[PDB]
């Protein structure tokens, strides 16, 4: 292979590995904030579904 092909092939390799590296660090930071604050799709632990509540008038009036 010529030096240019190897040279520019290396730039292509470096670009991909640097884009993967930046995303790996961002993912760790995003996971740090999602887990600590609970305001994202991840670490979304379930709470009771309010569709289970019955709102029909009850036998007594205070409820």
């Amino acid at each position: 292979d010529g030096p240019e092909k190897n040279y520019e092939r290396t730039m292509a390799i470096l670009q991909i590995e640097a884009e993967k590296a930046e995303l790996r660090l961002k993912e760790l930071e995003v996971r740090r904030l999602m887990r600590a604050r609970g305001d994202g799709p991840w670490f979304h632990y379930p709470t009771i579904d309010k569709e289970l509540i019955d709102h029909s008038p009850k036998a007594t009036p205070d409820n």
Partner: protein, 57 residues
């Protein structure tokens, strides 16, 4: 965390119906027919307000 409002004793003072349950049961069928309006108004208020203090009148 905040005191609970209560009506005054004079606010709760009314002329009660002092007849026994057998008297009520004997008159219940006619009583439901003749007094349905204020009765249903009061029941509608209780199930809406969910508050005995908001239905005294």
């Amino acid at each position: 965390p905040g005191i609970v409002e209560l009506p005054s004793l004079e606010d709760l003072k009314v002329q009660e119906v002092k007849v026994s349950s057998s008297v009520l049961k004997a008159a219940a069928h006619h009583y439901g027919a003749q007094c349905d309006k204020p009765n249903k108004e009061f029941m509608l208020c209780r199930w809406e307000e969910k508050d005995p203090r908001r239905c005294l009148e």
